[PDB]
Amino acid sequence: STPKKNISKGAVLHEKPMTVMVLTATEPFNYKEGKENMFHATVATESKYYRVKVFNMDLKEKFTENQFITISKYFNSSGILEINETATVSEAAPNQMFEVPKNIIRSAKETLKISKIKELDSGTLIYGVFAVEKKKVNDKSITFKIKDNEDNIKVVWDKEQHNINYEKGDKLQLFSFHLRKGNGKPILHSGNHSFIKGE
Helix, strand or coil: CCCCCCCCCCCEEECCCEEEEEEEECCCECCCCCCCCEEEEEEECCCCEEEEEECCHHHHHHCCCCCEEEEECEEEECCEEEECCCCEEEECCHHHCCCCCHHHHHHHCCCCCHHHHCCCCCCCEEEEEEEEEEEEEECCEEEEEEECCCCEEEEEECCCCCCCCCCCCCEEEEEEEEEEEECEEEEEECCCCCEEECC
């Protein structure tokens, strides 16, 4: 009876309602064959921004820029908000609304330096806008080398390569990539919810 369907392993349920303002939301996309589409979103309170993964497509209309929504029975997976059918998502009441500080909006849309990304814990989910230095396509994987002014890192995508035709010099917007660290150079690797988009 599946109230944790599509939800990450050790995600914590939050029953208390939280009002947020929607900052950004991607289009729905297929992340896994046979599964309902999902989309990525970023959302903010007065004190913080959150990355959001929503697995219920009945909610896309709720996730529009500058809309205030009240969310309850959502899951928290190491700081990432995950929303399925269990959640209640309603239009916010006027007195639940608020001003979002400029610094919160800025840091929500900000891209970390690659050198700084490598300092995060292994398993940290990575988001951001990066320039492509080069790419290698083989049959089983696409391997990007992304760079900024100071550093570079390898990005591995081993899922469907239908719309991953980006080229040298293009900027990629990455969503929910896994930072992998261990015996060797850190890499970013695609995972279940990984998504790439231009612009």
